[PDB]
Design a protein around this ligand. Structure first.
Ligand SMILES: CCCCCCCCCCCCO[C@@H]1O[C@H](CO)[C@@H](O[C@H]2O[C@H](CO)[C@@H](O)[C@H](O)[C@H]2O)[C@H](O)[C@H]1O
Ligand SMILES: CCCCCCCCCCCCO[C@@H]1O[C@H](CO)[C@@H](O[C@H]2O[C@H](CO)[C@@H](O)[C@H](O)[C@H]2O)[C@H](O)[C@H]1O
Ligand SMILES: CCCCCCCCCCCCO[C@@H]1O[C@H](CO)[C@@H](O[C@H]2O[C@H](CO)[C@@H](O)[C@H](O)[C@H]2O)[C@H](O)[C@H]1O
Lengths: 149, 410, 148, 49, 198, 50
């Protein structure tokens, strides 16, 4: 209904008479689909220095909280999630550390044949290794392949 | 459809975004994220990432009008999607786009002539595309009282979606755009439909004083340090390191016409920055470790005089080694020194080594089985670790038996 | 609505010429595509404070701000400490298909983008869509009819 | 342990990206023998007693 | 120094809209510059083939910004100027054709302008078209004779009044206030200021 | 305003916009010629449109 021009006979020339006004997308250059259905997505980039697991938990909780106000037909899905890989990696590294200490105990027992005599290094070593982990954490040294050498 | 129909038993979700790509944003770029079912349902190696990726390659190579390249996320996604060398062809001579393109094509031809050195060399940018050029007769427009600014603004608004201001929608500020309708900006003939107002207030069509022609242009322009450039990718040939092929490409560029430079970026820049200063840091580290192996057994006393012969072996020692192994060799020297130490200090050896032969193999096996978790999931990846490991353990046992006894007389 | 050459010589070179005097700068690369996007990536030396580098870059960009074209200024220029890695991707669909991609993208950008973007640990977010915009599609024949 | 700590002592006072990489070895090592000399004289005697 | 510079640059942004337009267009620089001069580099010509303007323009175009971004360099000062498309007006000729410098400036702004031409078949497009190509309308002028051919006014008899008819267009120095010499020969110089802490 | 702009442009080298030269953006300046801004008498040579 925006006025543009008034003709000599008094007739009005509105915007709708020369253009089709409609509510459309701001940028049409991107088209997204999910399993062939129309969809929109958000790519979340991890902030520098922030751990991935806690950030992902916070994001998922925020999405769950916001889900209460969604329109009647909107749902949320995760087509690209990397955090289960991180969780399984740490769950595997705990297992690998425990089997390493177990095999050290087994070798030492194969040596001495006396479990009371053999246990002393078995509890000796992991305290040193976890203390080293604590110092490298406190200083700010990341758990990187160089450290794992 | 291919992912969700032929291999439904391993894929979970297919999220395809059109108009986006790592090369930039464009109508001819496509990208797809694939989600897989959890490992509980993905059993065996035939349903692993590698096998499904290979099957995707084989099946999607049949796409006639596109290049579909399924691939896995690299180990370090922060440094790129592949390995090799990253190269920038700098035009620091102010030659122009065409001369630089000719130089790039010449470099590609030269590199392809010696496949024994560099393999899979390819440009990274996009090729030139036809573009539409509108020539406006300024004198003709001015003769009939039509401002050039009006013509340019009309064309830009019609074909460019000029932004006007903001408006309120459901309590949010959002932009307002003005553009021509869809069926009015799809063909070159669409320009002749447009009209513009003269000073007198009448209308004259754009076809009265404008001429159109087809030309070529670059859809993507790359610059490096403020200098026009085009990226060149590739990988070293099999059996060759990175430095040799890198130098060979440097000479190739030296063969290019004058005014064309070069530079390394990404991983190649990091390795170049490491290499040109590596000898000095390695020399000072060698001096430090020499002091370490010269301070414990009080000077040239017994073994530290035979470690004085170690530098001759070092200088005696095109095959190369990675950064990790350069420190691993020093650590191996240190652990051999320690394998000597708790018997040599006792001497400072019969009984000492009788009661310290066991710690030699405990430390050796501890190092081996501590680096083992870095590589192993149990069962897999264990057959190839028994070649170096067993030989090194046997050599260390022989060294413990013989050297800490021969070195004292040596 | 700009070609690669136009966006380059109107934005990229102008920004680059004022991108000197930065501490710990390693190198700088830029691209200019035909879609109208001018992207400049600056690599800093390892150990440099990302906040300090971002502040310096944003300050030096303010020098070239008056020299840029008006449309670029109105569009806004974003400087972010963005890493290339992607943490996670969240998709939104419609069950019955009652909403097309435009409605879903507009609702997402209007409601879910900025609270997620300000959530702790989130560096930056990218939307695979667009908000609403009051598009006005002109008709050349009708415009010529009324002398407009 | 004392000698290893001494020889690795002056490596952490020079800069550079390669220097920062070498810190990931040097700092962990000095901490390693410091923890070792602590534990050998502190923890193991208590156990064996 | 970084915190102080950031604070100063931020507080300056408050007064930015209040400054005159010409000052804004010229640009305002805030730098952590010390008064000491590390070293001075001069550039000369052997045969005298290049005057001071050519040498200064080449220096400012090629050697300034890589040296300025080199590590340890705080700031650099050029004893010269880049090129600038100087347009020397002629009052008598301007009066001859009934012209004013304002219209000359406006016409230069119009004709020496880049116009976003859009593209054919852009988003959103029809469902059955295969062509997508950018549209080029106008590009920024490059050569002096290109400027000399700028249309200003068309007389009643159809004759054209170009820029070259009322002004002498030539490639000249951006700032003529500085003149440098070396042993009496034309030259241009760069003053390199050491960065703080380097 | 016309008189002030005329004098300022003639004697002050008003800056207009940028242009491309050998792949570099450079400024464009408008000023009076050298032999027209050297003496006080030079002002009487100027004209402005009504
Ligand atoms: C038939 C022979 C069987 C021998 C099997 C030997 C090991 C094989 C793999 C088993 C791993 C299961 O180990 C399991 O890991 C998860 C975490 O992932 C742990 O769970 C723990 O950590 C998570 C957080 O990470 C907490 O929310 C949870 O409250 C806590 O209890 C459990 O303590 C443990 O039950
Ligand atoms: C639930 C607790 C008790 C149940 C046992 C399951 C967890 C304990 C692991 C030991 C059982 C597996 O027994 C197996 O033995 C061999 C030889 O000793 C060891 O493994 C060895 O061979 C495997 C197979 O090539 C290699 O990958 C590995 O590097 C090597 O150390 C491991 O111990 C284990 O792979
Ligand atoms: C006659 C022709 C001579 C041409 C010689 C060409 C190069 C030959 C080898 C020279 C290498 C000496 O290079 C030298 O390296 C050491 C580090 O090891 C650097 O020293 C630098 O790093 C260390 C930390 O690692 C810092 O504590 C130190 O403050 C710092 O200045 C010096 O910046 C440099 O003086």
């Amino acid at each position: 209904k925006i006025l543009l021009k008034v003709q000599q006979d008094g007739s009005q020339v509105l915007l709708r008479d020369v253009a089709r006004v409609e509510l459309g997308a701001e940028d049409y250059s991107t088209v997204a689909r999910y399993n062939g259905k129309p969809a929109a997505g958000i790519a979340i980039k991890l902030a520098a220095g922030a751990n991935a697991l806690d950030t992902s938990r916070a994001v998922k909780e925020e999405l769950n909280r916001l889900s209460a106000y969604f329109p009647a037909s909107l749902k949320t899905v995760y087509p690209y999630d990397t955090t289960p890989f991180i969780e399984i990696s740490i769950q595997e590294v705990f297992k690998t550390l425990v089997e390493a200490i177990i095999l050290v105990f087994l070798v030492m027992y194969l040596f001495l044949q006396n479990f009371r005599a053999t246990i002393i290094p078995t509890i000796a070593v992991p305290v040193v290794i976890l203390g080293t982990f604590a110092i490298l954490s406190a200083v700010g040294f990341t758990i990187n392949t160089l450290t794992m050498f | 459809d291919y992912y969700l129909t032929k291999e439904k038993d391993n894929v979970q979700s297919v999220f395809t975004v059109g108009g986006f790509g790592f090369s930039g944003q464009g109508q001819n770029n496509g990208l797809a994220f694939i989600s897989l079912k959890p490992w509980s349902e993905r059993v065996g190696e035939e349903n692993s990432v590698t096998a499904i990726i290979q099957r995707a390659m084989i099946a999607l190579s049949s796409i006639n009008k596109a290049v579909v390249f399924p691939f896995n996320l690299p180990a370090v996604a922060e440094l790129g999607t592949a390995s090799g060398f990253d190269m920038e062809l700098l035009d620091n001579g102010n030659l122009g786009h065409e001369k630089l393109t000719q130089a790039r094509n010449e470099l590609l031809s030269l590199a392809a002539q010696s496949p024994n050195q560099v393999t899979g060399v390819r440009p990274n940018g996009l090729e030139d595309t036809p573009m539409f050029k509108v020539n406006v007769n300024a004198a003709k427009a001015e003769a009939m009282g039509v401002a050039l600014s009006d013509i340019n603004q009309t064309i830009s608004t019609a074909f460019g979606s000029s932004y006007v201001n903001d408006f309120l929608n459901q309590g949010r500020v959002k932009k307002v755009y003005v553009q021509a309708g869809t069926p009015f900006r799809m063909l070159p003939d669409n320009i002749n439909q447009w009209y513009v107002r003269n000073a007198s207030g009448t209308m004259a069509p754009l076809s009265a004083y404008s001429s159109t022609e087809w030309t070529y242009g670059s859809p993507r322009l790359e610059r490096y340090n403020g200098i026009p450039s085009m990226e060149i990718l590739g990988e070293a040939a099999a059996g060759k390191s990175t430095g040799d092929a890198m130098k060979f490409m440097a000479d190739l560029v030296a063969k290019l016409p004058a005014g064309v430079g070069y530079s390394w970026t990404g991983l190649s820049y990091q390795e170049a920055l490491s290499s040109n200063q590596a000898p000095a840091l390695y020399a000072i580290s060698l001096v430090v470790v020499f002091l370490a192996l010269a301070a414990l057994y009080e000077s040239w006393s017994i073994p530290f005089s035979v470690m004085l012969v170690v530098p001759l072996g070092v200088v005696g020692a095109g095959l190369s080694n990675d950064v990790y192994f350069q420190v691993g060799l020093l650590t191996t020297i240190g652990l051999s020194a320690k394998n000597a130490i708790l018997i040599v200090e006792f001497a400072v050896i019969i009984e000492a080594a009788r009661m310290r032969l066991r710690p030699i193999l405990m430390t050796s096996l501890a190092f081996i089985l501590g680096v083992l978790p870095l590589v192993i999931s149990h069962g897999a990846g264990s057959g190839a670790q028994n070649a170096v490991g067993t030989g090194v353990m046997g050599g260390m046992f022989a060294a413990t038996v013989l050297a800490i006894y021969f070195v004292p007389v040596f | 609505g700009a070609d690669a050459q136009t966006v380059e010589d109107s934005v990229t070179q102008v920004i680059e010429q004022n991108m000197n005097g930065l501490d710990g700068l390693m190198y700088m690369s830029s691209t200019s595509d035909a879609a109208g996007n001018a992207s400049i990536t600056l690599t800093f030396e390892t150990g440099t404070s990302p906040d300090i580098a971002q502040v310096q870059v944003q300050n030096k960009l303010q020098l070239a701000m008056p020299s840029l074209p008006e449309a670029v200024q109105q569009q806004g220029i974003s400087v972010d400490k963005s890493s290339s890695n992607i943490l996670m991707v969240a998709a939104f669909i419609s069950d019955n298909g009652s909403l097309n991609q435009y409605d879903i993208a507009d609702y997402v950008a209007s409601n879910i983008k900025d609270p997620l973007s300000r959530t702790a640990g989130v560096g930056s977010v990218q939307l695979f869509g667009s908000e609403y915009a009051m598009r006005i599609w002109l008709d050349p024949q009708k415009l010529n009819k009324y002398n407009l | 342990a004392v000698v290893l700590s001494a020889v690795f002592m002056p490596m952490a006072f020079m800069s550079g990206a390669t220097g920062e990489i070498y810190r990931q070895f040097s700092i962990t090592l000095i901490s390693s023998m410091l923890l070792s000399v602590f534990v050998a004289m502190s923890l193991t005697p208590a156990l064996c007693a | 120094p970084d915190i102080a510079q950031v604070q100063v640059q931020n507080k300056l942004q408050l007064a930015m809209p209040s400054l005159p337009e010409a000052v804004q267009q010229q640009g305002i620089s805030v730098d952590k510059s010390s008064s000491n001069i590390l070293m001075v580099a001069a550039f000369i010509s052997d045969n005298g083939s290049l005057n001071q303007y050519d040498i200064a323009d080449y220096v400012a175009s090629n050697i300034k910004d890589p040296l300025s971004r080199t590590a340890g360099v705080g700031s650099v000062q050029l004893f010269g100027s880049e090129y600038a498309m100087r347009i020397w007006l002629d009052p008598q000729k301007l009066n001859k054709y009934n012209l004013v410098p304002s219209d000359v400036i406006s016409q230069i702004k119009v004709q020496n302008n880049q116009i976003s031409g859009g593209q054919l078949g852009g988003m959103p497009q029809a469902a059955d078209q295969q062509l997508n190509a950018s549209i080029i309308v106008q590009t920024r002028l490059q050569t002096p004779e290109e400027f000399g051919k700028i249309l200003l006014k068309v007389q009643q008899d159809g004759s054209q009044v170009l820029l070259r008819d009322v002004a002498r267009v030539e490639l000249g120095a951006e700032d003529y206030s500085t003149v440098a010499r070396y042993n009496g020969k034309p030259a241009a110089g760069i003053a390199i200021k050491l960065a703080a802490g380097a």
